[PDB]
Each structure stands twice: as structure tokens, then as C-alpha cells.
Amino acid sequence: HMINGSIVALITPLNSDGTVDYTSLEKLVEYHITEGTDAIVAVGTTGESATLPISEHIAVVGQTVKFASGRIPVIGGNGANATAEAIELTKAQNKLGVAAMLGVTPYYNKPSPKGLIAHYTAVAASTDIPQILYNVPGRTAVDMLPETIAQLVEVPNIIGVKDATGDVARVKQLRDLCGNDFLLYSGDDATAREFLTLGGDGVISVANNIVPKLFKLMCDAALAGDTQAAMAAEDQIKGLFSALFCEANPIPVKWAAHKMGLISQGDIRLPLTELSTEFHGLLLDAMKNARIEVK
Amino acid sequence: ESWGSHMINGSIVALITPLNSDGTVDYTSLEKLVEYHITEGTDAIVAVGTTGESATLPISEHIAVVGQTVKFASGRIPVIGGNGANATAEAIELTKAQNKLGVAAMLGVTPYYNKPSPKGLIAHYTAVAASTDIPQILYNVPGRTAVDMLPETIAQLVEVPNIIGVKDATGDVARVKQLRDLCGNDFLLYSGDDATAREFLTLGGDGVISVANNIVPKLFKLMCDAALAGDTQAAMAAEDQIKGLFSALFCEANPIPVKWAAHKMGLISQGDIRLPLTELSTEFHGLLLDAMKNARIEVK
Ligand SMILES: [Cl-]
């Protein structure tokens, strides 16, 4: 296993015709290598998994692996709200060369704890690739509590959990019920430094899409226990921790990216839409404040 | 008239999708459900919506169920196909696969999980509607989708010719009035929350796409007719008999409880259900069985 520190939930850049832009995707992979990002999640929420059918999903992940050329672990998204669909997505990724897979809890259909367990057990049963669980009730309508996560630790290849609740007290609870070995990632930038400080292993983040160097410093300092340096680094980027959510992720981050020249176009698949004029000002300020160089 | 009456209104069942022991669709139970609803007077059937477990049926199996439900109905009862998706392309695809099935309308939940803005919601439904000429019914259920599509956004779709109304499940009955004042008197309003169905009709809604319909269609029908007719006494008297089910069918996420009930009836042959959903846990068996007795259901 041993993915940790600053993990970027990568956006999927699109051509103005709406197809995947592989030139920008390559630029982004090099960028995270050039700065010091520890891993790349390909096609999760931030990467717009909802709007990418399986064949496109497989392509973006597979291409990201190719561009990385072994220099950085790539983790592929394998979440679905049907167990059978998740298994199929998992099987189609089994030989792309991912280090791991990130699987969100089934959204919309609100299964019970027993069902989440059976769900993830059957998904993990269909692969040798390490699985990371992902709880985000703000999006899924289901809260997968630590008591539930703990019953999955014994599944050989379930290696940890991303938790986006922002509820920092869960770190202790998760440590207590799972082992020291189970990996705990934060999925809430606003509480991340704190999450690591309480004993988290790393952060699967939106903001390190656009401030990876500083986001790395913050994560490394926190893990080392240099709280002063962690807070110091957090200080400069904290503004983005709310600005990148003035409309749902990845609407703002993708605008911020195509703005810094990171990507060729700001195109986004429907039902998602490009960031409203209303927020252009707010986000340019938070961006200039994080020492991001426009234009 | 003008000319043969009935638009889709009144008491509509969000139909259960019955399964065989091996998880395939049970067509003989499906046909039995369709007869049952005809005999008992249900106004219309939504096939493969949430209660029909739409998330765990791939598009092929989805359209077979819709196609067969229409067929079993054989012109005796309107069938509404679910066409909800969180990607526009996927919902266009699903809509197109249902054109020419003999469906009276389609019902499409707002995009879930990905949380589009209102401008995105409009673009989504415009594009879905543009790809068909079957009537479309919008579906708002923030409890499951994590977007709340507000009245003011629904109003901007009223102009889109074949969008005919909205199912609202929030249980905010103040929205009937708001929606009326912004949409037509002609725009169809459906309650999606059984606990507030009666009140929703009484305030000016046109119908209820209900979960409890599955197991108490006669009294439910009675309740909806009466409230539509403005006869509050009979409606309330109808409601009182079955009100207990409006809480008890939600002790686990729908359709887990209703499926158990329908089997324990049993309208179906098997209570099997598809992962990640699981059969009702035994903890709630007594809870639901007694709620069913109080609503006049038998055997047992
Ligand atoms: Cl998020």
C-alpha cells in the first residue's frame, strides 16, 4: 500500500467539443510530478466520474497511468451505487496499473450498514488491487460510520478510508476501532491540517489541484509534527478552502485551473456548468491571495 | 372533457420491481402487480423509479421492465417510465430507449450526487425533453439527491412544451401555493411524500406518486379521490386507517420495507432485492407487521 501525504483528486480536462483533453491531462500529471504531490486520484468526484461512462473512465485512468510512467502512484475511482456496476468498473481497471482504487459509498439509494459491508466486500472480492473507502454524506445521503468501516478492516485488500465529513473526532474513533495500519485520509480541505495533526495519514484534496507545492508543505509539516510550519503554510491557502466550493466541486477548481493556464479549456460536462460570473471576483481574489500567478 | 378526460392524476403507484431468487426480474409477479393495480383502481404506474430500484438495473434491464409493464397493462392503465440520471447524456440515452414503448410519460429525478447549480438543472432537463415528445415529469427529492430544485427553477421549465409537471418529495406543503403562482394552473403537481399527501392534494396538488400505494391501493385511491373532490372528512377518514404505514414503510430506506410487506402479503413470490440494498432486517419485522394489521391488510 503506502499512499500518503498530499494526494490530488485530479480534474478531467475537456476539449471545447467536450471530449477528454489528453494534452492537458499530460501537462497536469507532469505538473504534480514537478511539484511534489504524492499520488493522483483519476476520475473521482473532482474528475467528474458521474458524467464519464465506463469506457471513458477506463481511458482517462489508463492514460494517466501512461503519462505518470511509474513516477507517481495513480489511484482509479471505482465507485458506483450498484454493487454489480462497481464490480464491473473494478474489473475493467484490474490491469491498467493503478496502485489503488477509491470507491465512494453508494449514493442516492441509501443502503443500510449491512448493505455497505456486503457491497464493499463483494467489490474487494473481485480484485487484488488495494481498495480505499470513501464516505461523503453531503453528496451520497448516507453516513458510513466508523463502526461500519471497522467491520471491513479484515477484508485483506481494503486498506483505508477517505472521510469528507469534516468531523475531526472520527480520526480517534477510527484509530481506536481499526488498527494503526488502516489508512485514514481526509476529504475536507478546511479541516485537513487538523485531521493529519490528530493522526491521519494523508489528504485527498481538491485544492492541491492548484496549490500543490504549498499544500504539500502543509501536509508534510503536519505529519512531522511541526505545527508552526503546518499552520504557516495553511495560512496562505486557507482562503481557497471555502472559495473552491462557492458552487459544487469541481465547478470552481476547474475554472481556477483553466485560468492559471494549467488547462486549455474550462469545458465541463452537463449537468455541471461553468462557474457563474457572480463568483469570478471572489475566486480571483482567493487565488491572488494564495500566491497564484494570473494570467 | 377535450376529449376523453384524464391527464395523469390521482393515485399513482411507484411500482416495486419483483425479483426471482437469483436476482433476475420476476415477470410473472410483475404481471400480477399490474393486474392488482387495475382491479383496485390505481390511476397510473411509474415503472423503474426509485421504488422500482432503478439504480441497480442497467439500461437494458430497465427498458425491458418498462416495456413489459406497458405490455401487461394492455391499454387499461397509464404507465410512466423512469428516465432519471445524473449525467445528461445518460438520461438522453435512457429517454431515447423509451420512446416508442407506449409509455404515457416519463419521470426523471434531478441529477444526484454531483450537485449541479440551477442553470445546470435547466440545461439538463431542456436537453432531456428535447430528445423526445413523451411528456416529462420532473422529480425533486433533496433527501436523496443533495440538490433542492426550488419552485423558481421549476418555473423556468414550464415553457419547455413537453415538460408537464413535477413530483416534489420534500414534504414542504407551502410549495404547492408557490408552484401554482409561478407555473400554470395547467402544470401538474405531484406529492412525493405520503405523510403529507392528503394535505398536498387539499392545497391544490394534482396527484400522488406514492410508495404505500404498493400495498394499500384501494384506501389510498379513496383518500386521493376524496381530497381532490374537496371532501376532507372522507379523505381524513381514509387516511386515518393507513397513516401508520407512512412512517413504518421508511424504517429502512425505501423500497426495503415495502418490498418486505409486499412479499409478506404476498403480492410477489420472492422478497429478493439487489445489492447494495438488503432484505428488511428482523429488528423491524414486528414494527411493520403490526402497522400492516392496523391498515387492514391480511394473510398475514
Ligand atoms: Cl467534495
Ligand SMILES: [Cl-]
Ligand atoms: Cl427513505
